[PDB]
Each structure stands twice: as C-alpha cells, then as structure tokens.
Amino acid sequence: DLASLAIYSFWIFLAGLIYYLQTENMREGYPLENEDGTPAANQGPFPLPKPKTFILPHGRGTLTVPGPESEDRPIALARTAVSEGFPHAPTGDPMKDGVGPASWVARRDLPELDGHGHNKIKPMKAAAGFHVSAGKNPIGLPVRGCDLEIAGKVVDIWVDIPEQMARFLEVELKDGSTRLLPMQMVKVQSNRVHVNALSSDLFAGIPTIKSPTEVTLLEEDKICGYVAGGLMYAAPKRKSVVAAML
C-alpha cells in the first residue's frame, strides 16, 4: 500500500527532522552545567552538533558555535540550599551587580553596524533628516519614575536609522548628565514620560555610555538589563495605581 508506506516514511523523516532541529538549537548554552559550574552528568540524549562558523562583517571576526561559554564575569549570587534546584540569592546589590532580572551579557563593546558599516543607532540630533513623524513628540517632556517623582527630562530620541524607529529616549538628570531609556520601557503621555520600572532615585544608577554619539551592544545590554531589573528590585518604591491616578 503506497499510502501506508508514505505515512510510515513520514514519521521516520519527522523524527529525524526533530532530532536535527533540537541539536541545531544547542549551538548555545551547552554543555549543561551543575549549579556549581561543573559539567552536568546528564547532558540529555541529543548530542552537540558539529561546529559552524559565522563570518562577521567589517572586521568583526567570526563566531563558531558550539564553542566554549563566553560568559566569565563574576556572578554576585550565593547558593541557598544544599540540594540542587533552588534559588541563588544576590550577595550584594542585584541591580548594580547585573544578576537576576537585572542581568546583562558581555556583548561586543562596539555599536551594532548597519549594512553599510555605519552605526545602526544614533541620537536623532545627529541623524540627518530624521524627525518625529507621528504621535506625541517626547522630546522636552519631564520623566517620572514609579515613585511618582521627576527623574529628569527628555532631551533627544535615539533612532534606529535602518529601521527608522525610536529605540531609546535620552534623559537628562538633575546633575546635567544623561541616560538612555529603552523605548519599550517608557510610556509617552501628553504631559510626561512615565517609567514604571524605575523610581526617580534609580536613574543615576543606569549604566552610562562612553561616547555621547553612540551606544555599544555591551552598553545596551547593561542599560536594558538594569531597567528591566527595576520591575522586581524597585517594587518597594513603586507607588500604587490609585496613587498614580491622583
């Protein structure tokens, strides 16, 4: 029976495809480790795939995966139980140490480049011809934290030039310096920009950028990691919805 052979064959193929897909999705994060950092005994049934090499543009080298885990920075966390499967609590300030929902990855300390080799992101102020085309222009608006206090003001929008989109709001703090706030973590209102993830007192702590005209992937990660981490770690300073309503 042709139909029977066809369906029988399909399942063989499907099992083989799933096998392929799974191993293919082990190009990162493997081999698995024990909570102490040592190679875990059980690595699962699917074996690591053979190495593949990505050739990166504009003198950025190559990337080979699977490969030795890149992450080597110190992790400010301590074991909580003798048995495996339990939380590791922060030894210091999670926000400052970059752990938990405030984690960041040691990405390349260079800006992401577009197809021409130019910086993908740039403050609109320096993006020739760019302007706000629709919606409320956030530039000039005060920035309120979840403690309902003003944390600063918007002095510019950092745009993704190739994708023509707002990616960060540049916020000037009390001391005259500025920080970058991820666009997807702010709420532009008619009279202000509200940041639920952070209380006014936490803005100074947002990681800073070396140059005022560019932001690196390493910086973006530290910034985005830090801001998101506020949802959990700044909860004590986050005022109720009814309070915000007033």
């Binding site: 698995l32 875990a40 939380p87 752990v99 577009d114 197809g115 021409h116 949802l231």
Partner: protein, 281 residues
C-alpha cells in the same frame, strides 16, 4: 542541570502565591504555586479520564472517549458515567490551563520580561472555553460541547459542521481561515528571511537586517521590519483564534439554518435584488 549562562537568572522572587514556598526548580522546569496547581489538575483530570476508560471498557488511546451530558441534562449536573465525569475533567482542564498560564506569568516576573506569552495563550484557553463552556451554556446544554477522544472529537466537528450544511459559508469561519493561512505564510517567510541572512551563500559574510529589508522590498515593494514581523505573527495567530471562537459562539445561538443562506442578505439588497440575469437573477 543549567544552560551555561542560566545561573545568574535562577534568582528568588517573582511568585504570585506562597512567597518562596514553591520558588524552586526540578531539573529544567520551574515550579511555583501554579506549577503544583497544574500538576494537581493535570493528574486528577488524567485520572478521571483513565477511570472513564474503565467504565467504557477500554484502554486503547484511539478508542477512549469522554462525552458530555446528553441534551436531556441541560445545564445541570449528571451521573458520572453519563456526562458527569466529563464535567469534572473539564473543570480540571480549565484549572490546569489557567494555572499553566499563571505559572508563565511568575516565570515572566522572575526573568523581567513582558507578559505577551501567557496573554497569547489565554486566547487558546478562551477558544477552548468557548466550545466547552460559553457556547454550551448559551445554547442551554452541556451536550453541545465536544467529547474528549482523539477521533470522537473529529466526529463532533464533522457532525456539528454539517448541521449547518457546508460550514465553509460561516463568514467568521472564512476570516478565521484567512488568518490561519496568512499566519502560516508569514511564519514561513519570517523563518526563511532570518535564516537566509544568517546563512548566506557559502563563504559569504553574514547578512544584515538591511539585506532582509532590501530582499523583501525588492520582492514585493515593502518590508514590515524586524519589530513588525513579530507583531504581525502574534496578531495573525490571535486573530485566527479570535475569529474561530467568534464563528462558533454565534452558531446555534443567533444563527440556526444553513450558513450558505446567510449570504442571501447581500444578494437581496434592494437595488440589485430583482435585476434579471447572472446566477441569482
């Protein structure tokens, strides 16, 4: 065991219930209060199914089937082996689904990410509840729901559909199908585009998002963009399920005849209704 970059994330906090009581993992899986709630519901429900298999006199997966109370029972309860054992399993399924979603929310909290996933999942749950709860209740009986059986639920789909002739004529059903089709089309396109840029011709440098844009712009004269594509994928999926539930919730409640006849409203429009000729003239 943890992924080689997981440790820094396995932090305490994020739960919605029980503080740190269930705040732990088991292998790769995270638990939490809703992790155990899910296990409870899933186990009980699976157990109530195995028992219904017993009363049915079978252990074969292809045969096992749990039916809702017959139309006679209306919206009241019913004898276990006669609809009641289905009503409980339904409660368990709902409980296990909602708990699975709430567990996802705790996971989102711990990781500091958005809640888009559990929100998306709620649509699936809502489609289920539409068939098993909202429609039955609106129609006046649990008998209108579908049975829990691999092939039996297909019989239900077929029988329910033909009760209105060719179900293809349900207008909401058509829209839903468009979304399902368009979604699969975009999923293929998205998967292919990313991969084609990440895996250029042998020996070439990895392409950029700009190449992705140029490719599609060159192809159809537009590129929705990396943000838009994911926004689109979510919108198509949810819209597909939304219209699915909509096409059903209205069937047998506000529409009772052959769906094909519904389209007569357009044909009978005053200005051209009586013009001779064509198909309907």
């Amino acid at each position: 065991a943890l992924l080689s970059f997981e440790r820094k994330y396995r932090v305490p906090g994020g739960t919605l219930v029980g503080g740190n009581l269930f705040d732990f993992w088991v292998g790769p899986f995270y638990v939490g209060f809703f992790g155990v709630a899910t296990f409870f519901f899933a186990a009980l429900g699976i157990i109530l199914i195995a028992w219904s298999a017993v009363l049915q006199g079978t252990w074969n997966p292809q045969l096992i089937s749990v039916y809702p109370p017959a139309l006679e029972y209306g919206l009241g309860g019913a004898p276990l082996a006669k609809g009641g054992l289905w009503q409980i399993i339904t409660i368990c399924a709902t409980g296990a689904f909602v708990s699975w979603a709430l567990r996802e929310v705790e996971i989102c909290r711990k990781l500091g990410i958005g809640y888009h996933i559990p929100f998306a999942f709620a649509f699936a749950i809502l489609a289920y509840l539409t068939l098993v709860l909202f429609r039955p209740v609106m129609m006046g009986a649990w008998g209108y729901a579908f049975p829990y059986g691999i092939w039996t639920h297909l019989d239900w789909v077929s029988n329910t559909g033909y009760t209105y002739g060719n179900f293809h004529y349900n207008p909401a059903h058509m829209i839903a199908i468009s979304f399902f089709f368009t979604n699969a089309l975009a999923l293929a396109l998205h998967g292919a585009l990313v991969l084609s840029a990440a895996n250029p011709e042998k020996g070439k440098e990895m392409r950029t998002p700009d190449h992705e844009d140029t490719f599609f712009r060159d192809l159809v004269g537009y590129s929705i963009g990396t943000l838009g594509i994911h926004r689109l994928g979510l919108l198509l999926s949810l819209s597909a399920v939304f219209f699915s539930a909509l096409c059903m919730i209205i069937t047998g409640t506000i529409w009772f005849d052959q769906w094909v006849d519904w389209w007569q409203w357009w044909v009978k429009l005053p200005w051209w209704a009586n013009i001779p000729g064509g198909i309907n003239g």
